[PDB]
C-alpha cells in the first residue's frame, strides 16, 4: 500500500481508490495475526508437553518415589519437593549418591559343604583374607551364614 497509516490512505483517496490500498493492509495485517496465532499454537504445544511432564514428575517424584533412572535427578531418588515459580514449577529432587567406594575381591558363589551358596540380598566380598556378604549399595559386611 501507499502508506502504513490507515488514515493517511483515507484522507488522500476516495472510496474506489482507497479500497485498493486498504485491502492490501487488511490482507497483510490479517496474515500477521494468522502467523502470530500459528506460532502460538505451535508454542502452546511445547508448553503442553512440558506441563504434562511436570504433572508426571509431580505424581511420581513428589507423590511417590520413582525407581526410574535420572527421572528425578541424578542419583537414587529419595523424595522431591515442589516449588512454585512464575509460569513454571521447580522440583527439589533429593537423591542418595554413593560417595566413597572401595575395591573388593568378589565371587558369584561359595562352596561350604560341597554345595553352592548365593546371597539372598547382597553380594560376596573379600577384604583380602576373609569373606563377607554385604548389601550391594552400601558396604556393611556380615559373616556369611
Amino acid at each position: 500500500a501507499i502508506s502504513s497509516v490507515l488514515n493517511d490512505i483515507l484522507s488522500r483517496l476516495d472510496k474506489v481508490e482507497a479500497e485498493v490500498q486498504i485491502d492490501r493492509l487488511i490482507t497483510g495485517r490479517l496474515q500477521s495475526l494468522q502467523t502470530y496465532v500459528t506460532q502460538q499454537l505451535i508454542r502452546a504445544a511445547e508448553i503442553r508437553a512440558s506441563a504434562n511432564l511436570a504433572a508426571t514428575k509431580m505424581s511420581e517424584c513428589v507423590l511417590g518415589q520413582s525407581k526410574r533412572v535420572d527421572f528425578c535427578g541424578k542419583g537414587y531418588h529419595l523424595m522431591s519437593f515442589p516449588q512454585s515459580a512464575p509460569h513454571g514449577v521447580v522440583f527439589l529432587h533429593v537423591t542418595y549418591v554413593p560417595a566413597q567406594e572401595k575395591n573388593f575381591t568378589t565371587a558369584p558363589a561359595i562352596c561350604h559343604d560341597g554345595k553352592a551358596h548365593f546371597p539372598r540380598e547382597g553380594v560376596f566380598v573379600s577384604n583380602g583374607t576373609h569373606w563377607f556378604v554385604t548389601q550391594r549399595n552400601f558396604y556393611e559386611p556380615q559373616i556369611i551364614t
Partner: protein, 410 residues
C-alpha cells in the same frame, strides 16, 4: 560497515549479546555491464509503415512482417505526431532496451471515434466485425489523425468497414467475404432483397467532417519478448563478451546479474534461452557468435559472525560456510582456521579443548580468552576414564552423599 554492524542492523539493536549470528549470504557485486544484441545494421521500415501513401481498409486490414531491422523509433519523432500510442505487454520506456522475436504491423484506417475499439477486449462494429485483438495481446497500438491525407472534398469512399456479420470474429481474424447478410428469418439469394444487406459500408471521409468522423490511421505492432530467438532489436550497441566475471548482463533485452561461462549444452536452433528448475534463466545463446553460455549467480555461500557480548568486546570472528581456505571472503585475516563447518576468520585455533561456549558447528566451539582474543577449538566431551574392570573385582560404596538438585519446568 562490517559484519558486526550487519548483525546490529539485523537485530535492530546497538548492543549484541554473546553468540553466533547468521548473516547475509556472501555475494560479489557485478564488475561491469555487458550488452549483447543480434547485430543488424539496417533500420526498420518506419517510413513504409507510417508513411504509406494508401492504407488498407479496416475490413481488409494489412499485415506486414518486420524482421532483421533495428527498432530505433526515435527517427519518426519529427514527423509522426501520434494521437494514440499505447503498449499492452511492455512499458513504453523500455522499448529501446528490448528485442523482439516476431513483429507484425497491422495497418488500416478507421473513423476517429472507433480508435478506442482497437484496445483488446472491446465491442462495437470494429471490434466485433472486422478487427479483434486477443486478450493476451502483446504489442503497442498506434494511431494518428489523417484528415489531411485520406479525406477527399467529394468524400473518400475507398475505405470500407464491415457492418454486418453472423457472429463476432476471432482475434486477428480477417474477413473478406462480401456475401449478403440475412437479417430476417427469410433466406437470401442473388444480390439483393428485403432485409438483405451488403455486409460492407464505406466511410464518407470529407475534410469538413467533425473531428471524430475524420479518418484516423492505425498501426498495431504485435510482438513476443524474451521467449524465442530475436530478430528485431533496439538501438543499443553490443559490448564485447566477457566470461568468468560477475557482470550485469543484457542478452536480447534479458537483463540480469551473474557469472557467464561456456556451456556444453546443445540448443536446437529454434531455442535461445534455457531455464532452471526455479525457471530462472540459466543459459543463453550469444546472438553474435552463436555459442551457448551458462549463467550462474554470483551471490553464494553463507556467513556467520561470532561475537562475545558487546558489553565485553567489539572484536568479532567470521565463519564462511561453503568456503574452503585449505578467497570469497570479506577480509584477509592474520589467523585463518578451516573447519568442517567452514572457513573461520579472526579466531585463533587452539589445540587445548575446552567446554563449548559458542557453538560454531562440526565439533568446533569458540570463546573469548587471553590481551583478550577469540579462540577456536574442538570441544571437549568430558574427562576420559578407564574403568577398573576385572573378572573378580567389585567396588562398593562405604558412604553416601545426600544431594538436592533443582529442576525447572515451564
Amino acid at each position: 560497515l562490517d559484519p558486526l554492524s550487519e548483525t546490529k542492523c539485523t537485530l535492530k539493536s546497538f548492543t549484541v549479546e554473546k553468540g553466533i549470528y547468521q548473516t547475509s549470504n556472501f555475494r560479489v557485486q557485478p564488475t561491469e555491464s555487458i550488452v549483447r544484441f543480434p547485430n543488424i545494421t539496417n533500420l526498420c521500415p518506419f517510413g513504409e509503415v507510417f508513411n504509406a501513401t494508401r492504407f488498407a481498409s479496416v475490413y481488409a486490414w494489412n499485415r506486414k512482417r518486420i524482421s532483421n531491422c533495428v527498432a530505433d523509433y526515435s527517427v519518426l519523432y519529427n514527423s509522426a505526431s501520434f494521437s494514440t500510442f499505447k503498449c499492452y505487454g511492455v512499458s513504453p520506456t523500455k522499448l529501446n532496451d528490448l528485442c523482439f522475436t516476431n513483429v507484425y504491423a497491422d495497418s488500416f484506417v478507421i473513423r476517429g471515434d472507433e480508435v478506442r475499439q482497437i484496445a483488446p477486449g472491446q465491442t462495437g462494429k470494429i471490434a466485433d466485425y472486422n478487427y479483434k485483438l486477443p486478450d493476451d495481446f502483446t504489442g503497442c497500438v498506434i494511431a494518428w489523425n489523417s484528415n489531411n491525407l485520406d479525406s477527399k472534398v467529394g468524400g473518400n469512399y475507398n475505405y470500407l468497414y464491415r457492418l454486418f456479420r453472423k457472429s463476432n470474429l476471432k482475434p486477428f481474424e480477417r474477413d473478406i467475404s462480401t456475401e449478403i447478410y440475412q437479417a430476417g428469418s427469410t433466406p437470401c439469394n442473388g444480390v439483393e432483397g428485403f432485409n438483405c444487406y451488403f455486409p460492407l459500408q464505406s466511410y464518407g471521409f470529407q475534410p469538413t467532417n467533425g473531428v471524430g468522423y475524420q479518418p484516423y490511421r492505425v498501426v498495431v505492432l504485435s510482438f513476443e519478448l524474451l521467449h524465442a530467438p530475436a530478430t528485431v532489436c533496439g538501438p543499443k550497441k553490443s559490448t564485447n563478451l566477457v566470461k568468468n566475471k560477475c557482470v550485469n548482463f543484457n542478452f536480447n533485452g534479458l537483463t540480469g546479474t551473474g557469472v557467464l561461462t561456456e556451456s556444453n549444452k546443445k540448443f536446437l536452433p529454434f531455442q535461445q534461452f534455457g531455464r532452471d528448475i526455479a525457471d530462472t534463466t540459466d543459459a543463453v545463446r550469444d546472438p553474435q557468435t552463436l555459442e551457448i553460455l551458462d549463467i550462474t549467480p554470483c551471490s553464494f555461500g553463507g556467513v556467520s559472525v561470532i561475537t562475545p557480548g558487546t558489553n565485553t568486546s567489539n572484536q568479532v570472528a567470521v565463519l564462511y560456510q561453503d568456503v574452503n581456505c585449505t578467497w570469497r571472503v570479506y577480509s584477509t585475516g592474520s589467523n585463518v582456521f578451516q573447519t568442517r563447518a567452514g572457513c573461520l576468520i579472526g579466531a585463533e585455533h587452539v589445540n587445548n579443548s575446552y567446554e563449548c561456549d559458542i557453538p560454531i558447528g562440526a565439533g568446533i566451539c569458540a570463546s573469548y580468552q587471553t590481551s583478550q582474543s577469540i579462540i577456536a577449538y574442538t570441544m571437549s566431551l568430558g574427562a576420559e576414564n578407564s574403568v577398573a574392570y576385572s573378572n573378580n573385582s567389585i567396588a562398593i560404596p562405604t558412604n553416601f552423599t545426600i544431594s538436592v538438585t533443582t529442576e525447572i519446568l515451564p
